Amino acid sequence: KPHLRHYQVVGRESPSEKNPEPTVYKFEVFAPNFVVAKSRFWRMMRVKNKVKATHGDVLSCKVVKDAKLVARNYLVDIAYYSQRCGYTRMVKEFRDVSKTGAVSQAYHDLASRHRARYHNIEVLNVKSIPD
Amino acid sequence: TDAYAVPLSPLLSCAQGIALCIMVKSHYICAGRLVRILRGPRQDRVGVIVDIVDANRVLVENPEDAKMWRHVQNLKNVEPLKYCVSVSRNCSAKALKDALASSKALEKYAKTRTAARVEAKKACAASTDFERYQLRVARRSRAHWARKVFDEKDAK
Amino acid sequence: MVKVKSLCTLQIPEGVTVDVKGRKVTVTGKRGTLTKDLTHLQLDLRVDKKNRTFTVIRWFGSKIPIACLNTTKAHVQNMITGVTKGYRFKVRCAYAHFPINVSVDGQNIEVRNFLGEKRVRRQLVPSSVKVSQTDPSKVKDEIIFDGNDLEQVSREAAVLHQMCLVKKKDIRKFLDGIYVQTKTNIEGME
RNA sequence: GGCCAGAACCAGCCCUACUGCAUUAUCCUGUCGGCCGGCGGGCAACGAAGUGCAAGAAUUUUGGGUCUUGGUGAAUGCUCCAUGGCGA
RNA sequence: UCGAACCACCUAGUAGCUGGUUCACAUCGAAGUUUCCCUCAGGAUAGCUGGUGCUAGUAGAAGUAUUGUGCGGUAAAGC
RNA sequence: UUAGGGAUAUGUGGCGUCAAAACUUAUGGGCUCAUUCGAUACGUGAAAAGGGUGUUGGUGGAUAACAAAUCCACCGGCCCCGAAAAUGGAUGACGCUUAAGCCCAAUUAGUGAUUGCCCAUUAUUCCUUUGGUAAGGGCGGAAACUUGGAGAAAGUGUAGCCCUUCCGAUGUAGAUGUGGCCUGGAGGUUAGGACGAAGCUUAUGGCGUGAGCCUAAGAUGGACCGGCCUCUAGUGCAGAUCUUGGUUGGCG
RNA sequence: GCGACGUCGCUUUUUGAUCCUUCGAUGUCGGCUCUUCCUAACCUAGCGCCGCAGAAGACGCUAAGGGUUGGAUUGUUCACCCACUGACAGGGAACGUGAGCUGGGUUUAGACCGUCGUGAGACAGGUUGGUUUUACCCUACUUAGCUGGAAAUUGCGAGAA
RNA sequence: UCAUCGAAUCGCCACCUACAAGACUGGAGCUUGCUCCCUCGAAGGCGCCAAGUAUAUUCAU
Ligand SMILES: [Mg+2]
Ligand SMILES: [Mg+2]
Ligand SMILES: [Mg+2]
Ligand SMILES: [Mg+2]
Ligand SMILES: [Mg+2]
Ligand SMILES: [Mg+2]
Ligand SMILES: [Mg+2]
Ligand SMILES: [Mg+2]
Ligand SMILES: [Mg+2]
Ligand SMILES: [Mg+2]
């Protein structure tokens, strides 16, 4: 029912004719599809690694399984962009069931109050909170 | 064209749900005790509420014997019953949902009233065209016999 | 955005009895009685027992839903207090030359030769707010309002100060007017 | 003849059940307390889905001539012969 | 009738200007651009377009990429 | 992006009424009250700083005391003012505000993997036309239960030689084709007519996509004339302040 | 109350552009007359506020509701004075308003003058004299009648404040 | 001159929908309003067609 599943996308940089064994990059992104995961996989590597989607290959994107469906806390360090105060990060600790669920509320909250939508939004540290 | 529940019988009323809800503070109504869901694909089941997560949303479950999973059902179709297990006066939200329900609080309610109406309206949906005759000779009987009793009252 | 803070409570002693019927409040005592209305968002007034506790819970909350709860707390205590203790309202004046007269006739108030205006300035007062003068000699100036209700005698001990101003004129150099004086909670043990 | 209704094969849109089919991790235990850290073996997959095979059977619509026939046991082959039902 | 009368004639004077130009269906189907013109309300010439074609034509094909291989000095940059 | 129809499905745009579609979605996440809210791009731009002691969001840095919590500074709007004209007045109208507004999502409801739903000259499929000179196959006598054709003729063109197959199909100026339409007349042929020709009338049908043709019936007409192949031209009219004739409105 | 320095929004009875509409004709300014509209308030109207004691002004806000003159010179708009007034505010309506008037200015054909030109003539320089057609049509308005009408002329169609 | 379209009907509707009394004694009743659906009520008993398979109900105010 909550959209925006959680994808585990990993990939080298088409090895290599120069380096012959480029370091593998893996990161987990929330996305509606996996085409949208790879689209934002090759945005981190184009920026945080200077690697094109052309000059590299996706090793194994994957759908993370779940957590036993039970309520718990979540602080989601989220970073959006807007003409509304360009590139501000946030914390916005939510209380939903799964990481997919809470990050959904994260997006539907920023697009609600900052009108920042999916591609203007990076995510980091979707972790939980005991108390 | 109006279906009726009187008074003030209602135009244009869909026969697949109602806007029942009147807003109430969450904590008073419910606390991991027991509840039933009106509008679900599984229809009119009762599951004791495992916990409250955020505001409207609840986690609703039931031990077994009902094909009811542990799941996230929203208060918009989940309405409290006063057959609680762990809400309110009783000291804590309990665990071991089967054992707490092995206090027959569900078994008592499933054989008490307001559950004889749940399957009543679910009987009038599975009544084939033969029991609908049975129901009509049953009302017609109680009907005129009611008139006979009225005649007796007139005599008295 | 939205949260919950606390709950509001008032104790109801002997000599004061509060109802809850039609979600409205009735407070009576041994010096006066008064009833009024206190509706607002998420503000459902329910009195637990007849003389135990006036509780007003709200389930939602924000700056506006919570800046409206404890004003009924400011407006339920003075129901219970006014029916036993009551708050008196006093009014004074000043003069330099104009010798004056004033009047009160049963249910109305007169103001004659105000600043030189030789006519009457009427004003209606509700059923049960009785007042006299001490123009005779010892005080000579004051109008002392008595009663029971916080805002049903404050409402008219507000207009006599609206019935006063001198408009196209320097105001500070001279003080024409019998104006409301010294907001005060007068109690008594005499 | 025109007006209908029903039926039957053709293809077509299809009703779709069960969904199997593999994978992947989910998850199986241990003693701890109202700030939580002291971890390991996959041997379980009915709420794992970026994923493979299904007709008999549901529907109006549209067109109707070179047919149909009988099953065998293996590791699918011999084959034979020449529309009806109303109303007007 | 007069900043050149009136009648008839040359005379149906000329007009790069204005108005109009009579049936159907079918098959296709544009241009306002080039150069030249006392040229810029027009022409001529190419282009566009139609018809008829001729001819051995998966080629002497391409508003496309690839591969190599040249070219360039705008953006950004730098003073 | 466009031949004539039917169906299936979409596009853009939408689904409170007008208005087909959520008969007001079991909608979900927040936002929003706005004394001219706000609400489809491009229409032209809507509103510019500025602040606050305002409603919601975020970061720097205290106290454990404000008058068991309470601060000192700003980032971010939704929103308040800043801001105004002249017929009455516009989201398109009503209207909506615990939305029918805004931003995100959804699509049968956390039960289990698809198309929520409505609209086209689009798409798919089905017929029908028509062109391509597009491919084929027959291009003179045989049978599937009832008729049609794998027997209708060696053919650009039709009432196609016959089937069936593919594909395309808009269009101003323009070009071109038509076994194509029509008027006057000629050379041929075939043929009508006082038992009623031309003409004329039309709720006279039919049939050709059309130009048009043919029929009927005239309480019309009275004496000429149709089809076909060639020939021929003073050959088709709604529109030229057309020309001529006649009528008409305004108009008793 | 504004003024250095400055700037930044919105302004047309604005200075000009633009060449989009009009060349088989949207008839030229100003008035007269009459109606309307706006507020950026001139007057009255409402408090407000000051070194606003009375007096009397002073600043301000709210309000388009009502009111806003008569003359002299000018064709004028504007301007200027005269005088009244509570004050004589500023605008739109095709620079409101000629099938309404006027015809003073633009205004051609006559004529004179100034400068210019060899001359014919030119001047957006001056001066004088110089057409002002048509509603009998449709609507608008204004009054004046008549008659139908509830499935707003129809079904029998059925709804009584 | 009518042949019609229409197709539940009210002394149980139809002040009120909601009171009164539970952070644990139930209240409910100011009610899923009745009744209607093939012989006035459930147990029978009874005639029906040829109106010859659908065709506006060949009914009914
Ligand atoms: Mg540069
Ligand atoms: Mg359709
Ligand atoms: Mg919402
Ligand atoms: Mg001739
Ligand atoms: Mg001619
Ligand atoms: Mg003619
Ligand atoms: Mg004409
Ligand atoms: Mg004029
Ligand atoms: Mg005068
Ligand atoms: Mg008229």
In B, residues 4-33, which contact C (CB 8 Å cutoff)? 23-28
Report chain B residues whose CB lies below 8 A from the CB of A69: 59, 70-72
Residue keyed to tokens 């104009």: C98
Report chain B residues whose CB lies below 8 A from the CB of A94: 54
The residues pairing with A28 across neighbouring beta strands, listed in sequence order, are A8
Measure, in angstroms, how far nucleotide F185 C1' is from residue B56 CA.
99
Report chain A residues whose CB lies below 8 A from the CB of B70: 69-70
The Cα–Cα gap between C151 and C82 comes to 10
3-state secondary structure of B58: strand
Measured in degrees and rounded to the nearest 5, phi and psi for residue A88 equal -110, 135
The residues pairing with C117 across neighbouring beta strands, listed in sequence order, are C114
Q: What residues contact C163, with CB distance under 8 A and at least 6 apart?
A: C111, C121, C123
Distance C13 CA to ligand 10 centre (A): 84
Q: What residues contact C145, with CB distance under 8 A and at least 6 apart?
A: C88, C89, C90, C91, C129, C131, C153, C156, C157
> Which of B21, B24, B25, B75 to probe by mutation at the C interface, max C CB count within 10 Å?
B25
3-state secondary structure of B137: helix
The Cα–Cα gap between C8 and C15 comes to 22
Measured in degrees and rounded to the nearest 5, phi and psi for residue A110 equal -70, -50
Structure tokens, A88: 């501000």
Q: What is the number of residues in chain C?
A: 190
Q: Convert B127-147 to b/e letters by CB count within 10 Å (16 or more is b).
A: eeeeeeeeeeeeeeeeeeeee
**Cβ-contact C51, C18 below 8 angstroms:** yes
**Cβ-contact A35, A73 below 8 angstroms:** no
3-state secondary structure of C21: strand
3-state secondary structure of A116: coil
Pick the residue from chain C with its C-alpha nearest to B26: C59
The Cα–Cα gap between A98 and A128 comes to 10
Distances (CA, A) of B13 to B2, B16, B78, B79, B122: 7, 9, 21, 21, 20
Residue C11 Ramachandran class (φ > 0 left, ψ -120 to 50 alpha, else beta): beta
The set of strand G positions with any atom below 7 Å of a protein CB reads 47-58
Measured in degrees and rounded to the nearest 5, phi and psi for residue C105 equal -120, 85
H/E stretch holding C180: strand C179-180
Distance A100 CA to ligand 9 centre (A): 89
Nearest to C32 by CA among C76, C72, C87: C87
Q: What is the number of residues in chain B?
A: 156
Residue keyed to tokens 């957590």: A67
The set of strand D positions with any atom below 7 Å of a protein CB reads 24-27, 34-36, 47-50
Count CB neighbours of B66 within 10 A.
13
Residue B108 beta carbon within 7 A of nucleic strand H: no
**In terms of DSSP bridges, do strands C89-92 and C53-57 run parallel, antiparallel, or are they unpaired?**
unpaired
Count CB neighbours of C66 within 10 A.
17
Nearest to C178 by CA among C108, C85, C102: C102
Measure, in angstroms, how far nucleotide F224 C1' is from residue A68 CA.
108
**Cβ-contact C101, C128 below 8 angstroms:** no
**Cβ-contact B50, B61 below 8 angstroms:** yes
Measured in degrees and rounded to the nearest 5, phi and psi for residue C180 equal -55, 135
Structure tokens, C125: 């007062």
CA distance C25 to chain B (A): 22
Nearest to A121 by CA among A85, A79, A93, A83: A79
Report chain A residues whose CB lies below 8 A from the CB of B59: 69-71, 97
Residue keyed to tokens 């929330």: A30
H/E stretch holding A28: strand A25-31
Q: Give the nucleotide nearest to C168 (CA→C1').
A: G52
Residue C49 beta carbon within 7 A of nucleic strand G: no
The Cα–Cα gap between A123 and A91 comes to 10
Q: Which residue pairs, CB below 8 angstroms and at least 24 apart, start in C156-160?
A: C156/C123, C156/C125, C156/C126, C156/C129, C157/C89, C157/C91, C159/C123, C160/C91, C160/C109, C160/C123
Pick the residue from chain B with its C-alpha nearest to C41: B23
Residue B39 beta carbon within 7 A of nucleic strand F: yes
**Cβ-contact C120, C111 below 8 angstroms:** yes
In B, residues 26-55, which contact A (CB 8 Å cutoff)? 50-54
The Cα–Cα gap between B151 and C65 comes to 60
Q: Give the nucleotide nearest to B67 (CA→C1').
A: F111
**Cβ-contact B149, B156 below 8 angstroms:** no
Any idea what DSSP says for residue B74?
B
Residue keyed to tokens 């008490």: B112
Q: What residues contact A84, with CB distance under 8 A and at least 6 apart?
A: A114, A115, A116
Residue B45 beta carbon within 7 A of nucleic strand F: no
Measure, in angstroms, how far nucleotide D2 C1' is from residue B155 CA.
69
Measured in degrees and rounded to the nearest 5, phi and psi for residue C143 equal -120, 110
**Burial, C111: exposed, middle or buried (Cβ in 10 Å; 0-12, 13-18, 19+)?**
buried
How much of chain B is in helix, strand and coil states, percent to nearest 5?
35, 10, 55
Residue A63 beta carbon within 7 A of nucleic strand D: yes
Residue C174 beta carbon within 7 A of nucleic strand G: yes
**Cβ-contact B26, B54 below 8 angstroms:** no
Query: Does the distance separating the beta carbons of C57 and B24 come in below 8 Å?
Result: no
3-state secondary structure of B20: coil
**Resolution, in Å, please?**
2.8
The Cα–Cα gap between C56 and C44 comes to 6
Experimental approach was cryo-EM
Measure, in angstroms, how far nucleotide H31 C1' is from residue B7 CA.
10
Sheet holding C89-92: strands in order across?
A: C131-133, C143-145, C89-92, C179-180
The Cα–Cα gap between C107 and C165 comes to 24
Q: What is the number of residues in chain A?
A: 131
